[PDB]
């Protein structure tokens, strides 16, 4: 009949959690690191608990803390 061969378009590092390997699109808490990288607020505070440096940007992601332990 019977297409359309159809995309958004625009789908590059826009709203995509590369931690939990899934796209977001609507209402999600996003957080962007100081090293310019946007991720999901939950998963960034999962993978980057024990690590705190952009693997390419070479900037510390914890940018002050200011916790303890």
- Chain positions contacting Zn ion, by CB under 5 A: 17, 20, 35-37, 40, 43, 54, 57
In the bound complex, what is the minimum distance in angstroms from residue 26's beta carbon to Zn ion?
14
29/69 with CB nearer Zn ion: 29
Mark 2-27 as b/e (b = at least 16 C-beta within 10 Å). Answer: eeeeeeeeeeeeeebbeeeeeebeee
Q: Which is nearer to Zn ion, 40 or 48 (CB)?
A: 40
Strand partners, 16: 23
Assigned token pair, 11: 């789908």
Is 43 one of the annotated binding-site residues? yes
**From the annotation, which residues make up the binding site for Zn(2+)?**
17, 20, 40, 43
């Amino acid at each position: 009949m019977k297409q359309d061969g159809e995309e958004g378009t625009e789908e590059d590092t826009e709203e995509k959690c590369t931690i939990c390997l899934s796209i977001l699109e609507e209402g999600e808490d996003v957080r962007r690191l100081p090293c310019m990288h946007l991720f999901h607020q939950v998963c960034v505070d999962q993978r980057l608990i024990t690590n705190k440096k952009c693997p390419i940007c070479r900037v510390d992601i914890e940018a002050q803390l200011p916790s303890e332990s």
